[PDB]
Design an enzyme around this catalytic site. Structure first.
Site, PDB file in Angstrom:
ATOM      1  N   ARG A  71     -19.079 -14.997  16.235  1.00  0.00           N
ATOM      2  CA  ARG A  71     -18.630 -14.516  17.542  1.00  0.00           C
ATOM      3  C   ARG A  71     -17.369 -13.659  17.520  1.00  0.00           C
ATOM      4  O   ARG A  71     -17.180 -12.827  18.400  1.00  0.00           O
ATOM      5  CB  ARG A  71     -18.434 -15.698  18.496  1.00  0.00           C
ATOM      6  CG  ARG A  71     -17.440 -16.708  17.995  1.00  0.00           C
ATOM      7  CD  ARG A  71     -17.123 -17.778  19.019  1.00  0.00           C
ATOM      8  NE  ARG A  71     -16.169 -18.727  18.459  1.00  0.00           N
ATOM      9  CZ  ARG A  71     -16.506 -19.790  17.744  1.00  0.00           C
ATOM     10  NH1 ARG A  71     -17.779 -20.061  17.519  1.00  0.00           N
ATOM     11  NH2 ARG A  71     -15.561 -20.541  17.197  1.00  0.00           N
ATOM     12  N   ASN A  72     -16.501 -13.850  16.535  1.00  0.00           N
ATOM     13  CA  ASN A  72     -15.281 -13.051  16.468  1.00  0.00           C
ATOM     14  C   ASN A  72     -15.376 -11.937  15.447  1.00  0.00           C
ATOM     15  O   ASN A  72     -14.366 -11.418  14.969  1.00  0.00           O
ATOM     16  CB  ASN A  72     -14.059 -13.914  16.165  1.00  0.00           C
ATOM     17  CG  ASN A  72     -13.716 -14.844  17.301  1.00  0.00           C
ATOM     18  OD1 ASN A  72     -13.590 -14.418  18.445  1.00  0.00           O
ATOM     19  ND2 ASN A  72     -13.557 -16.119  16.994  1.00  0.00           N
ATOM     20  N   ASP A  90     -11.094  -7.403  16.962  1.00  0.00           N
ATOM     21  CA  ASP A  90     -10.334  -7.831  18.125  1.00  0.00           C
ATOM     22  C   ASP A  90     -10.125  -9.311  18.124  1.00  0.00           C
ATOM     23  O   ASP A  90     -10.969 -10.093  18.592  1.00  0.00           O
ATOM     24  CB  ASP A  90     -11.031  -7.401  19.403  1.00  0.00           C
ATOM     25  CG  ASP A  90     -10.102  -6.641  20.313  1.00  0.00           C
ATOM     26  OD1 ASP A  90      -8.881  -6.677  20.041  1.00  0.00           O
ATOM     27  OD2 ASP A  90     -10.575  -6.015  21.280  1.00  0.00           O
ATOM     28  N   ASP A 146      -9.811 -18.623  13.427  1.00  0.00           N
ATOM     29  CA  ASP A 146     -11.016 -18.815  14.228  1.00  0.00           C
ATOM     30  C   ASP A 146     -12.049 -17.787  13.774  1.00  0.00           C
ATOM     31  O   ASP A 146     -12.552 -16.987  14.564  1.00  0.00           O
ATOM     32  CB  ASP A 146     -10.683 -18.655  15.717  1.00  0.00           C
ATOM     33  CG  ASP A 146     -11.876 -18.915  16.630  1.00  0.00           C
ATOM     34  OD1 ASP A 146     -12.890 -19.512  16.177  1.00  0.00           O
ATOM     35  OD2 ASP A 146     -11.779 -18.525  17.816  1.00  0.00           O
TER      36      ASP A 146
HETATM   37  C1  01P Z   1     -17.688  -8.797  22.203  1.00  0.00           C
HETATM   38  O1  01P Z   1     -18.207  -8.008  23.298  1.00  0.00           O
HETATM   39  C2  01P Z   1     -18.424  -6.639  23.182  1.00  0.00           C
HETATM   40  C3  01P Z   1     -17.560  -5.884  22.345  1.00  0.00           C
HETATM   41  C4  01P Z   1     -17.749  -4.479  22.234  1.00  0.00           C
HETATM   42  N1  01P Z   1     -16.933  -3.713  21.422  1.00  0.00           N
HETATM   43  C5  01P Z   1     -15.573  -3.803  21.204  1.00  0.00           C
HETATM   44  N2  01P Z   1     -14.942  -3.007  20.308  1.00  0.00           N
HETATM   45  C6  01P Z   1     -13.631  -3.050  20.035  1.00  0.00           C
HETATM   46  C7  01P Z   1     -12.832  -3.976  20.715  1.00  0.00           C
HETATM   47  C8  01P Z   1     -13.503  -4.805  21.659  1.00  0.00           C
HETATM   48  N3  01P Z   1     -12.745  -5.714  22.384  1.00  0.00           N
HETATM   49  C9  01P Z   1     -13.113  -6.667  23.315  1.00  0.00           C
HETATM   50  C10 01P Z   1     -12.231  -7.795  23.433  1.00  0.00           C
HETATM   51  N4  01P Z   1     -12.580  -8.767  24.318  1.00  0.00           N
HETATM   52  C11 01P Z   1     -13.749  -8.768  25.140  1.00  0.00           C
HETATM   53  C12 01P Z   1     -14.101  -9.881  26.040  1.00  0.00           C
HETATM   54  C13 01P Z   1     -15.318  -9.875  26.835  1.00  0.00           C
HETATM   55  C14 01P Z   1     -16.220  -8.721  26.742  1.00  0.00           C
HETATM   56  C15 01P Z   1     -15.920  -7.579  25.861  1.00  0.00           C
HETATM   57  C16 01P Z   1     -14.704  -7.603  25.066  1.00  0.00           C
HETATM   58  C17 01P Z   1     -14.317  -6.616  24.145  1.00  0.00           C
HETATM   59  N5  01P Z   1     -14.844  -4.689  21.867  1.00  0.00           N
HETATM   60  C18 01P Z   1     -18.812  -3.830  22.966  1.00  0.00           C
HETATM   61  C19 01P Z   1     -19.703  -4.566  23.820  1.00  0.00           C
HETATM   62  C20 01P Z   1     -19.494  -5.991  23.917  1.00  0.00           C
HETATM   63  N6  01P Z   1     -20.362  -6.738  24.705  1.00  0.00           N
HETATM   64  C21 01P Z   1     -20.778  -8.082  24.270  1.00  0.00           C
HETATM   65  C22 01P Z   1     -21.189  -9.016  25.408  1.00  0.00           C
HETATM   66  O2  01P Z   1     -21.384  -8.381  26.680  1.00  0.00           O
HETATM   67  C23 01P Z   1     -21.993  -7.124  26.567  1.00  0.00           C
HETATM   68  C24 01P Z   1     -20.925  -6.223  25.965  1.00  0.00           C
END
Ligand code: 01P
Length: 285
Positions: free
Chosen positions: A139-140, A153, A135
């Site tokens: 977005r990922n 992640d 996937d």
């Molecule tokens: C993609 O989202 C973000 C990632 C990161 N950094 C980060 N670094 C390392 C691992 C990580 N893991 C995860 C895994 N699953 C998630 C599921 C839902 C939300 C967050 C999650 C974060 N994330 C920082 C800010 C945001 N966001 C994006 C959207 O809302 C505003 C904040």
């Protein structure tokens, strides 16, 4: 030995809700080399979760204990004691690449090629380890403080991108608009199909994350992409990028470039830092 004392972890604000529970933004104190504190992303498990979800969580993290590439969000540590269980990982301040890109809505090429090249180095590292992201899409992919793009992640979950998936024959959620025609058909995912998604990620980078095949329906995508259809070259797309794109969208999977070959072709258009951190130049390669 990836075990960390809760004492060493703070937690400072919710980021959002993850497949297994709320994921927070925080700090750790004994998680990097020569680095007192370190901004980290904390992943918890819902309190409602089944004793099977706490074993899926703890296993998704046991998966990354085998990874170590500067271009794949890193697992800094686990707190497998007490509760709430905690999985600790490298924080990506700027978030997912799709949102980031949707942010910049009115990149150079030096900048577009730097993204593409890091993602590809990440994949090359993964595929090299016999892993097949299934996937791979903007977005990922997450963006760091210094703008580095990483394959981070794994999958994440749900979120604001529900429209990005569809249930081909009501048999579950699949990212059809990023899937190779052979996958759409047979349903199998390979490193070659990974390359197919790569070019869609590149197409995403050129369109600042537009929806692939926007004028089409999911049921229409399936027909179109399975019959030999491709995406159009976006408005001001660098003749290079698009050339790399359709190198990836070769119908026959075997006629497609590998991720290493993709880096090799752009190896010298990327910031000087790449060579000292990448997998491509690593002795591992
Ligand atoms: C993609 O989202 C973000 C990632 C990161 N950094 C980060 N670094 C390392 C691992 C990580 N893991 C995860 C895994 N699953 C998630 C599921 C839902 C939300 C967050 C999650 C974060 N994330 C920082 C800010 C945001 N966001 C994006 C959207 O809302 C505003 C904040």
């Amino acid at each position: 030995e990836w075990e960390v004392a809760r004492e060493k972890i703070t937690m400072s604000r919710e980021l959002g809700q993850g497949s297994f529970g709320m994921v927070y933004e925080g700090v750790a104190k004994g998680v990097v080399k020569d680095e007192p504190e370190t901004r980290v992303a904390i992943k918890t498990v819902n309190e409602a979760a089944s004793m099977r979800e706490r074993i899926e969580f703890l296993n998704e993290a046991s998966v990354m204990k085998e990874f170590n590439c500067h271009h794949v969000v890193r697992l800094l540590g686990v707190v497998s004691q007490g509760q709430p269980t905690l999985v600790i990982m490298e924080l990506m301040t700027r978030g997912d690449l799709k949102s980031y890109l949707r942010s910049l809505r009115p990149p150079s090429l030096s900048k577009m090629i730097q993204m593409a090249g890091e993602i590809a180095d990440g994949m090359a590292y993964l595929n090299a380890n016999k892993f097949v992201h299934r996937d791979l899409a903007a977005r990922n992919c997450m963006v760091a403080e210094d703008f580095t793009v990483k394959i981070g992640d794994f999958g994440m979950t749900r979120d604001i991108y529900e429209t990005d998936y569809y249930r081909k024959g009501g048999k579950g959620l699949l990212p059809v608009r990023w899937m190779s025609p052979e996958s759409l058909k047979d349903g199998v995912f390979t490193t070659y199909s990974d390359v197919w998604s790569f070019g869609v990620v590149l197409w995403e980078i050129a369109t600042l994350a537009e929806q692939p095949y926007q004028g089409l329906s999911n049921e229409q995508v399936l027909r179109f992409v399975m019959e030999g259809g491709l995406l159009d070259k976006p408005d001001n797309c660098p003749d290079m990028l698009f050339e790399l794109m359709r190198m990836c969208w070769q119908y026959n999977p075997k006629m497609r470039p590998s991720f290493l070959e993709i880096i090799s072709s752009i190896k010298e258009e990327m910031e000087p830092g790449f060579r000292e951190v990448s997998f491509y130049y690593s002795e591992e390669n």
